């Protein structure tokens with residue numbers, strides 16, 4: 001990809017200040033005239049199978065456009081150096097948004113934000129793209145509008161170590177039991193069983209955050225979280241411990257369902273969110 | 278606190294040697310060789326240049342917002358108040374390059390994990406003494422500063438050729454625990470069954486960790502899953518099934534043919550799943566195995582230096 005193969009007309013785009021690092025390259029702010037987000041990756045693997053899948057997923061993301069999904073614009077690959085360019089999201093992460101004192105969530109606003117997220121995920125699923133990293137920090141809220149970011153990105157195989165693991169707590173809260181059981185040192189993220197059902201479980205966690213403005217499990221040693229999540233015990237005890245409303249809690253129990261196959265689709269979840277207060 | 282005079286005079290010697298070295302910064306030090314790495318950090322034998330002393334420096338690498346970085350350094354300076362013949366000599370803590378460094382005693386023989394791999398197995402005679410040392414350290418810690426250790430395992434028991442035993446890397450800072458230390462999971466687990474299910478835990482969890490460690494050192498193998506019957510005469514599993522074993526299966530036990538009742542019973546009491554019924558430290562201190570080994574006569578330093586090849 002030499003960036004001229006994309007439908008967004010581009011003469012030149014300039015890097016601006018960085019705005020965070022992570023397992024997948026460094027994210028800068030930039031100017032396409034419009035602001036954009038530019039993610040810089042480098043490919044250790046250097047095997048052309050990895051670049052083949054990268055090409056596959058990046059042209060798959062071209063086919064997407066939806067008002068609740070961040071606009072994928074471009075990607076260029078001068079291997080080992082690669083760049084992914086999406087539209088820049090003004091406003092605040094839903095994560096820092098529910099955690100604000102001044103913010104006023106209510107039985108209506110939560111359902112509305114949730115329905116936005118559900119429409120976005122439903123689109124992504126229809127085109128057969130799995131997010132694999134839906135979480136509160138990957139949803140943006142600017143006035144009325146809600147946008148999902150950072151989708152499909154876990155499928156790639158660039159530089160990220162040791163034969164131990166380091167797992168942030170915020171992330172593991174969004175992980176379904178199928179996944180955390182497979183975690184073990186020396187296992188890469190690409191071999192884990194992400195899926196549509198795991199995505200609706202992660203939606204369960206973001207809805208709980210909409211209710212309680214916090215994690216469902218208080219910060220603790222990661223081994224503890226792995227056991228509590230993959231045993232299903234921890235999520236049963238949270239459903240026990242402080243409750244919300246019956247119809248509210250039904251969606252949570254459905255999304256967090258231990259057996260993945262009993263988890264609802266996103267189309268169904270739209271209906272469930274409709275028949276509410 | 279039953280502070281011996283031998284002990285108080287090597288405690289005095291290193292607190293007054295502590296102000297002789299004074300204060301601290303990166304280029305005062307100089308590398309020697311690779312001590313090791315774990316849980317997000319590497320530690321190296323170092324020479325401080327103002328003071329010819331050889332120390333051990335712990336560097337761990339944490340880019341985060343500076344406010345909590347300084348909360349961490351100020352919470353960690355309490356290590357200056359923590360001083361017992363059974364807790365590593367602490368000297369200083371500082372921020373440099375966004376890499377926290379802790380300067381501590383160098384321990385000639387390293388960790389009982391290191392000791393163990395070369396030694397293969399650790400005799401019972403000697404595990405008595407290390408057990409006494411650990412209960413003393415944990416009680417000192419619980420009574421004097423009201424903390425718990427939270428990370429007891431053989432790689433955190435340190436030995437020297439002068440024959441002392443002390444514990445390193447105890448959980449002194451809450452901020453460093455919540456912001457970094459929690460996120461790591463290794464290939465083995467020493468966590469109690471009540472910590473794994475996320476209830477409130479206590480020093481009881483540390484009793485459990487110590488019991489599992491004593492089994493590992495006594496038989497030379499990480500004890501769960503229990504060795505198979507033929508594997509026992511001679512002397513591939515993911516992390517979740519390990520944790521699920523720890524929570525849902527009987528605990529390890531020492532083999533009945535080889536070690537005394539007193540040892541078998543000590544460890545059996547450390548490894549009871551219900552922390553209410555697990556021995557506390559008051560009870561462990563007066564246990565038969567302890568009364569025996571405390572009054573025994575073992576020359577530890579000799580065993581250590583002929584074990585590893587020091588002098």
Ligand SMILES: Nc1ncnc2c1ncn2[C@@H]1O[C@H](COP(=O)(O)OP(=O)(O)NP(=O)(O)O)[C@@H](O)[C@H]1O
Nearest residue numbers: 019020021022023024027037086087088089149150
């Ligand atoms: N389209 C975007 N608009 C605005 N900010 C963005 C956009 N995409 C990513 N970011 C920001 O990029 C930063 C880092 O994102 P990211 O690299 O994905 O790290 P992370 O989500 O915090 N955890 P990880 O996915 O492991 O890196 C965060 O501050 C995001 O808010």
Ligand SMILES: Nc1ncnc2c1ncn2[C@@H]1O[C@H](COP(=O)(O)OP(=O)(O)NP(=O)(O)O)[C@@H](O)[C@H]1O
Nearest residue numbers: 312313314315316320333382383384387388432446
């Ligand atoms: N003061 C010390 N003197 C000598 N060796 C030390 C000292 N402190 C640590 N070590 C060695 O450093 C290595 C790893 O230390 P460490 O950073 O504690 O990792 P770990 O014990 O495996 N996990 P953790 O203690 O929870 O961070 C081990 O081989 C120890 O023997």
Ligand SMILES: [Mg+2]
Nearest residue numbers: 022133138150
């Ligand atoms: Mg992300």
Ligand SMILES: [Mg+2]
Nearest residue numbers: 432433445446
């Ligand atoms: Mg240690």
